Design a protein around this ligand. Structure first.
Ligand SMILES: [Zn+2]
Ligand SMILES: [Zn+2]
Ligand SMILES: [Zn+2]
Ligand SMILES: [Zn+2]
Lengths: 80, 80, 80, 80, 80, 80, 79, 80, 80, 80
């Protein structure tokens, strides 16, 4: 069941609201403020890859004050 | 509990072996091969941030074939 | 026939609008929403490199919300 | 049937060879020598997302002389 | 205490204003105008990781004129 | 006394070795393993600018394993 | 006679306008629209180095909607 | 005497004006329009490094049209 | 006729060798040593874009030292 | 006279030797160890631009342990 990490660069004074908003998106398992060149990361479980359309194109990129998105799509798991 | 996302660039031919190895380190909840500028991502759960010494400096950076590493430390969770 | 891969970075809330706009253009064979640094990627087929002025500068770049383009034109094919 | 564009930087001498070794991978529909920061592009057609491991990790990256790989995975198409 | 290095790129006319304001924050032990790509660096001391939210997201990023912030969080010290 | 922040990117297996060695140099007040693109940061205190040669060129860069250094030199402190 | 290649990033709609207004500069031997991180290239011909001010600062950068310019100046030829 | 090289990216239409403005600043021995990813370079002579406050923070960054600045502080001369 | 601008980054002590080596190739109309990130720039003149494999992949990339190429192919000329 | 600033990235343990060597080069007015992403800067006065062939291509790139160079050529002075 497909995993993705969405790296989100918001506007400084949007971080809290954008994090609270993104937590509500059905496919989003976890979301955090992180150190580094991106300010938020969303851990997202998809039933299919088309669902990045719903959670990123629509869920995330349609939110006011998001500047840049980068999706790291997991294609092989290493369990145990 | 402190979450981090460790982004890892191995030498090409070392992806699988490094993925399998990183999976066995205790603090490593999940690891995947991903699309993007990095090739693997480990999702890590820590009791203290110091444990990044154990998991990244020692655990990961001591493995041969790991060219670059970048840790996105989560400092705030957005649940619910 | 000359192939080109056109990478498009649209404004966030314009991804769907521009993907659909680009699919209309006669030279575009396929166009997708993709993971990575460019939200859209058009697979373009061309009579001659000259025609890329009509698809890129006229066709794509005239549209509102296109921040960046980057055309990867193909000069040698590997058949079978 | 998932589409992905694999961006490949090979060592300069290996280019015309590596392309011919890429073409003969099972999942590669089209493969080109291109202008830009990546020398080869592979148009891949996948059964699922997990089949990226077969075409990239255990495929493209296995081969001698491939320096970098970047996969742009298509999750939504735009018809017409 | 946890140590962090907060790298701040202000709008150019805001350097002094932002500098003096960051120095008022309880967690900031030292803050400087520096050479390099970030005009201000804050040396911060934290009770926990979570306190980074109070200093960066609520404290610095709430301020007028801050373009980018980048936190380097110290997980291990080397004494002597 | 001038302050500088020295950003050290070591070879991954050298992190601790270099950490401990940099801690020995008389001008280094604090040195840490950090998150980010540079594994080590040294907080240095200088008698004059020229003393940077002693710490960086003769001191850090004369050590086995250091890939890149970047010095952020503080020319103005903001008190309170 | 100094050669330089001026790399120009225009605003997306301005490309065809600027491209035609670049050619109309006294020093521009041939301006093209190209692939890559820069949309226009100006192959310039100079009497001396100071004449870059004429063709770039007072030339190209005086036109509406030029976002970035990068000049690669030729200092040696290989026959 | 402490030397620095200040690299200045102005707005296009401000280059000339800013070059003339920066020339009048006391500590500025020479200024030029240059080739490269920066447009102006001021060569600066300082009695103390604090003086970068006067010349850069105040002198330069307070001029309108200056988009990015970068200071290369010289900490060792090689005469003869 | 199709004009291309080829940018070459040779190994340092190979600049003169490759510049003179590039100048022989039949399609190369001009080649210079230049300021910037790429030491050499060939002005190439092609009959068909398929000829870039001759000039770049075998013609330029086969030679020792050439660390990186980037071809700016032209698709629209501006006359007068 | 034509002015140029040559930014030199040497190998860590080469800085001093390369700084001393570059200083004896006839066209080199001043050379310094500097802070930032480049380690040395050479301030160079030329009678003609071809002289970058003697100072840079030969004078500098021929020296062992120089990794990258970038020349910012001054084309207009702003005196006073
Ligand atoms: Zn959907
Ligand atoms: Zn530990
Ligand atoms: Zn002062
Ligand atoms: Zn000469």
């Amino acid at each position: 069941m497909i995993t993705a990490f969405v790296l989100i660069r918001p506007r400084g004074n949007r971080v809290q609201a954008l994090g609270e908003a993104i937590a509500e998106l059905p496919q989003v398992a976890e979301v955090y403020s992180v150190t580094g060149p991106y300010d938020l990361v969303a851990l997202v479980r998809l039933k299919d890859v088309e669902e990045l359309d719903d959670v990123v194109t629509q869920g995330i990129l349609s939110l006011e004050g998001v500047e840049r998105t980068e999706t790291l799509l997991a294609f092989r798991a290493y369990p145990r």
